[PDB]
Each structure stands twice: as C-alpha cells, then as structure tokens.
Amino acid sequence: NRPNRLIVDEAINEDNSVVSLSQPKMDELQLFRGDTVLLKGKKRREAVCIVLSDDTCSDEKIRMNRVVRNNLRVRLGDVISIQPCPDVKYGKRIHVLPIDDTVEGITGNLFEVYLKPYFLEAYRPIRKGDIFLVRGGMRAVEFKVVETDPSPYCIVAPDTVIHCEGEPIKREDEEESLNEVGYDDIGGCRKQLAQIKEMVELPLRHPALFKAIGVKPPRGILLYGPPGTGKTLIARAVANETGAFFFLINGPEIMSKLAGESESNLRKAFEEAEKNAPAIIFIDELDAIAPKREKTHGEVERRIVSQLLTLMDGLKQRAHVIVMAATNRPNSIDPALRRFGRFDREVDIGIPDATGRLEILQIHTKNMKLADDVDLEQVANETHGHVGADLAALCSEAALQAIRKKMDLIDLEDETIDAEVMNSLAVTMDDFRWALSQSNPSALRETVVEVPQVTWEDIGGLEDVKRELQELVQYPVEHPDKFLKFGMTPSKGVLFYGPPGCGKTLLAKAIANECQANFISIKGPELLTMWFGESEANVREIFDKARQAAPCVLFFDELDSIAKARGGNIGDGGGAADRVINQILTEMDGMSTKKNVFIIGATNRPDIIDPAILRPGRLDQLIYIPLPDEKSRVAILKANLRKSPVAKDVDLEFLAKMTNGFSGADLTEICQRACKLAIRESIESEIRRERERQTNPSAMEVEEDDPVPEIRRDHFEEAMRFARRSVSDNDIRKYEMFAQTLQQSRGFGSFRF
Amino acid sequence: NETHGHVGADLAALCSEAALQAIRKKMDLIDLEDETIDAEVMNSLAVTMDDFRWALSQSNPSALRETVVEVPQVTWEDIGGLEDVKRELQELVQYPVEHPDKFLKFGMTPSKGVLFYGPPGCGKTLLAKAIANECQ
C-alpha cells in the first residue's frame, strides 16, 4: 500500500539471477540490473542483493527471487525501498559461518574452493538469510555467515577473506530458526490483536508521532484474556515480530525458597529489561496472582502482589516496555491491574470464531501440504462446530488418519518414501473426512461423552417434525443473513411429546446423531451438590459451558421429570431448585448471543411443566403429544423390520390391523420376543442334532436350523398371543390433559383477514 | 469363558488366588515337606480345575467386593415350581452366551428385566436367591 511497493512477482529464476525490474522501477528508483539494492524483507530480512532488471524481456511488474524471498520470508510486493548499500562495508576477517549442512554433501575442502569462487565475483546475491544458489564440490555450499551487521555480504575488497568459523553449523538449528513464529500465525483477531500490535508498533515505529499528538503516548497495553486457546502462540509471534527484549515471565519464577527472593528477582528483571532497551515484558502465567490478594490469606502471595503493583505503579512506572495480560480467567483477575496504570493498560479478551477459523484452518493447512483435491476450506466451513484452537488437533487427526492409511497400505517403507506419502498426507478429503468422523470438540469431550445412535433418517415417523427440526438447524447454518434480511431472529427452543418416552428419548438420540453441529444432552441427575451453595453453582457452570459451546444443541431429559418449577410447586427445592430455574430462565432470558439454542424435554406430565419455561423465549415449539396411528404403526413396524431378517410369511398389513394403536415399544418388544423364540428353537435344534449321535452332522444349516433364516410367522403369532396392549384409560386421561393444554393454547378459526 | 465377571488386575489376582488355593491344598494334602520338598510334587500340583473353581467361587469382582456381600443361596433345583419362569430365566441367561448369534440372525436386542409381580408377600426373595445361586 505504498508507492515504494511495486508489484513484486516471482522472478524468472527462484534466485536473484533473472529478476525483472520494471522500466518504471528502473526509472523512479535507481534500479539497475547489476546494482546493490537495499530492499525490504519481512522478519528482519536485510536484502542487499543485485536484482536484475529484465524489463527488456518483459517490462512487467517487479519480479522477485522466489527461493531467496521464501528463505528470507520476504513479501513479494512489499515496499522494497531498494537503495544502494555501499555504506555497509565488510571487514577483512569476519566470522564467516561455515554451515555443516552446507558441507553435508560437499566433497573435500570445497569450502576453500567455493570461497575462492565467492571471494572475487561471487556471482550470487550479496545478502544474508535468503536462498542464494551456491554451488561448490558438486553440492549446495551455503556456508555463509547468518548475517553481518555491517555488510552481511562481501562489501570489502574481493581478497578480504573473512575468517571462516571453525565449527560447522548443523542443519537442525537452521531448520529451527527458519520455522519461526511469524505474524502470519497471528490471524483471526485481525481487529483486537491488530489494534494492540499497531499500538505497540507505532509506539516503537513512530513514538515521535505519539509525542507530537499533544497527548502523552499510552504507557503500555495489557493483553487480551484468551480462553485457553493458547496465548503463547500470539505472544511468541509478536516477540518474533518485535525487536524488543521480551523478558519472559514464568509461574515458577514467582516461587522463592528464600525470603522475598522471587519479588526481588522480578523487580531486578524488570529493571534489567528497562535499562537494557525499549524491551518488552512477556508476562506469562498472567492468571497466577489473580485476585489482588482480596480474599487471599497468603502473605507471601500478598507480598508478591504488592511488589507487582509497585512495579506497575509509582515513579517511572511508564518505562519503554509493557507487559502482556494473557489472562486465563478475567474473573479471577482483580481491578488492581484493570486500570490503565494499574497494569500496562485496560486488557481485551480473546476468543475463537468459526468464520475466521477457515482462515486459521487455511494457515494450518498451508503449514504442511496434505491434500490436493480436498475442499478443505469448504469442509472446514461446513464443520463450524470446530473448537477453533482445536483446528491444529483436527489437522493432526487428518494427518494421523492418512499416515495410518499409507503405513498400513504398505510396510514401514522408510527407504521407498512414496511420493504420495512424501509430498503430502493425502490429496483428497479421505483423511479429512476420517478425521472429522474421529474428531470432535475437545472442550465438550472433556465435559461430556456420548453413546452411539442411528440417524434421524434411519428412524421413521414425524416427518413434518423432523423436517422442521432440520430446517431450524439449517436456517442459521445456511442463510442466517436471510433471517437478518427478513429482519427477524431465530427461534430459541422446542418441546417434545408423544407417548411416555416410547422412543421419544430414542427420537432425541437419533436427532442428535443426525445433527450436523454440536449437541449436548443433559440428565436431571447431575443437578444437586450435597454441599449446599454449590448445586446452583453447578447449574451456572453447566449453563456457562453451554454458552461457550455455542453453536451447540442444548438437549436435556424430560424437564417435566427434571425441573418442575411451576410443575412441582410454587415453592421450589429449598431455594436451590428455585435458583436453578432462575438461572435457566436467565439462560432463557437476559442478553446473550445464543448461537445454537435447543430444548429437549419429554411430556412425562404436561402439568409438571414450569410455566416460565412454557413461555416463548424459554420454549418456542410445543411438546406435541403423538401416538402410533395405524399408518404410523405400520411405518414404525416397517422401520423396525428394516434392520431385521424378516420373512414374507409375516404380513405387515395384518400386523397394522391388529395394532389398533399399540405402542412402538410394544412392537419392538413383540419383535424381540419372536426373535427370542426363534433363537431358542435354533439352539434346541442344534443341541438335539448334536446329541442325536456322537458322530452326527449337527445343524448343517443354522438359519435352516432356525424355523427360517428370517422370522417365523408362527413365531410372530405366538408372540402376538403372548403380548398385551399399550393404550390405557390413564393414557387416555394424559392425552386428554395434553389436548386441554393444546386447545387452551389453540385459537379456533383460520384467522384470515 | 466362565470368568466373564472379573477382568484385568482382578483377573490376575484371581489367578494368584487359584494358585494359592492349589498350593494350600497340596501342602495340606502333604506334610510340611520341609525335608523332602519334591519339586516333582510341586509341579504335579500345577493347578486343578477343582482348585481353580474353588478359588473362582471364593473370588469375586473387586468393584462388587466393595459393593455387595452375598449370603447363601439355594440352587434352582431347590426352587419349586415356576417352570415357565425358570425357563424364561434360563433363556435370559443363555442370551448372554449366544446373543451375538441371535443379533446376527435377526438383529433384535434382548429385554432388560421383568417385574416379578408375585403374590403379595408370598416371598419373592426366595426366587431372587434361587436366581442368584443359578446366576452365572
């Protein structure tokens, strides 16, 4: 975004040999094909190379050394104010760094031969930190000094042979240095983190501007409180991106086996960092002395807090450094730092977003090539339930799945490193899908576990209800903007009814199984702490975990059997249940995002319903009490048979006719009874055949040893005769109560104007 | 196959207990043997399915060991009548041993349990104890 920023594309060579400086580049700047150019490179990449001006072949935009820029992590398009670097002059005997990786492949004293070829007419870019084509001893002898403050290259007489370092530099250190934590990994918080970084940088890059503002510059910046995503990543990326001696703090450093040694040491470290330079204060474990010793009885902790405040306050507190408020929990933190001056500044908070997660997912994927035909960004957007910071774990899972696939498809095969196994982990969404099936959000995983179930499509009935639930899930997922465009908001919650849990719990389980996003179920048992004053705390913690779990589906047990706040009595369970209902309504009301809101509860007793929950905002969709209709009974029977070996001798039409509105659980029980009868018959036949002779062909066909491989119509009739009904006059009364609740909340008439 | 209740370190402790029971029997079946400790006799002791079964009956799962404490239970032979009920209980027990086959054939899960709505106060604890003794 600067005039000194031409459009630097990759040069015709990955080195600086075929650079194409534009005619405008060669004109506005003294950009010769063979002139030393002090260009700009990222992560402190001092470029003093001689980039060619191949505007004759094509007077296109700037062409930059691809390999050199990649090794120097340079920005192809940055404002490379490429000026002459004749001022930087090298010494006659400088500490030239002979790399062991450079000699790892070079034959003999090829270092001396290359130096002779490099001392005069080096025929390569004159810089440091980039990828320069250096050939010697039939190998890449990049035995160059990492950098020299004056003239990183030979800017002295060609015969000024710098005294090469005796030790050979191993490739492991070079790899570790190259894999630095750049500001690229600092994405996502491109608003808050960007603002904080700009505040820090302007103070460092234009402190005169801050002084000339007339107002004093900010004395510091307290960092955002990250919710466990790992703020060390941001801190390390900033410290690498920053030229300040960021004194790293540590919780262990706060421990002193002596008297006041930790506080004195911390003060000494702060003083040393300040006197050192306009350094930084990498305040790690920022949530250690959190409460400002308000309720804390620890005098040593109190003394530490006092020393910390004295460092953060008092005379000359505003040094040329600032600390990072990497808060694990801001509620633990106390106001003794929350003031701009009580700490570096007023701190922000950090949290993950799924839309930006694809960008974070993009970075994680770009870290290591692992797929070609995989729409990884598309799937990652399709998987918005990802925990965000767990995107690294998800990538590791995809890598592990691909590694298992390849390493099982072959032997160890270390020598025959397959190109598919060498270049990437996969080339398609096979590994990604394996991970996604395997992967799940770690926070909820530690919070809760689950049992498997069949899909919502794998179960039948309530097609309108299932379609409505799916549409409700998809609407925010698919076109939340359309609802914003409609100028309306999504619905909060639903209520489920029917028979007395005749698969209603099963229906909820199947819906959760088919659920695209996260779905947390609840049971009434995890409610009350024996120690009083904590059960309501447990409810609050559960609600907070749910809120942090957004977008997730909030499922629970039958609320009529869980919390009958206006269903049990006006007076609740010793105030504990009252506070639980108050939090739930406060979960149902107040002011919150509620990205994915759901409500699962069976009409065990419609009178056990709490009216506060019954209202909208607490429950939108009503618990429609269905029963197995004759057609519905036939559908349920067909669905149950679908997973079973049924026989044509059994007539589902006669089964439905005999059903006369029997429970689906009753049908399942009848199926189980018939299966048990058939299994007993088969076992008895096998035993009889075995006992027929000491040498007899016992049960030559087990499915034929069963009355049929499929079920026996005789067994079905026997089970039916051994079965009872499910419709009750008490069930009639419960249905009547539900119908009274409905018709009471039902207005007679079409209401069409 | 019988030891379907205990597992892991419980199974290892059960094996140690079976060895201890067999050794105690053999040493009791012999004298102190402090003068001629026949290593052939010790090897022949080995382990008896009798000794192993005696320990296994003596043994129990560690979780139940802190949970329940059984009392004597008469066998289903001592149980009188309820022939259909006994058959149903036996079928339920056998369901554990071959239910893989049943699920493979039909694909139907078994029932959990039955409410023994017996005669009022006729004594169902007798039935429960008989089942527990017959329980595997």
From Swiss-Prot, chain B:
Determine the domain of life of the protein's source: Eukaryota
Residues carrying N6-acetyllysine? 102, 105
Which locations, inside or outside the cell, does it occupy? Cytoplasm, Cytosol; Endoplasmic reticulum; Nucleus; Cytoplasm, Stress granule
Write out the PTM section of this UniProt entry. Phosphorylated by tyrosine kinases in response to T-cell antigen receptor activation. Phosphorylated in mitotic cells.
Residues recorded as bearing Phosphoserine in the entry: 62
Residues holding ATP 2: 121-126
Question: Residues where Phosphothreonine occurs?
Answer: 36
**What does the record say about domains?**
The PIM (PUB-interaction motif) motif mediates interaction with the PUB domain of RNF31.
Q: How does it assemble?
A: Homohexamer. Forms a ring-shaped particle of 12.5 nm diameter, that displays 6-fold radial symmetry. Part of a ternary complex containing STX5A, NSFL1C and VCP. NSFL1C forms a homotrimer that binds to one end of a VCP homohexamer. The complex binds to membranes enriched in phosphatidylethanolamine-containing lipids and promotes Golgi membrane fusion. Binds to a heterodimer of NPLOC4 and UFD1, binding to this heterodimer inhibits Golgi-membrane fusion. Interaction with VCIP135 leads to dissociation of the complex via ATP hydrolysis by VCP.
Tell me which family the UniProt entry assigns to this protein: Belongs to the AAA ATPase family.
Which disease does its entry mention?
A: Inclusion body myopathy with early-onset Paget disease with or without frontotemporal dementia 1: An autosomal dominant disease characterized by disabling muscle weakness clinically resembling to limb girdle muscular dystrophy, osteolytic bone lesions consistent with Paget disease, and premature frontotemporal dementia. Clinical features show incomplete penetrance.
What this chain does, per the record?
Necessary for the fragmentation of Golgi stacks during mitosis and for their reassembly after mitosis. Involved in the formation of the transitional endoplasmic reticulum (tER). The transfer of membranes from the endoplasmic reticulum to the Golgi apparatus occurs via 50-70 nm transition vesicles which derive from part-rough, part-smooth transitional elements of the endoplasmic reticulum (tER). Vesicle budding from the tER is an ATP-dependent process.
Recorded protein name is Transitional endoplasmic reticulum ATPase
What's the encoding gene here?
A: VCP
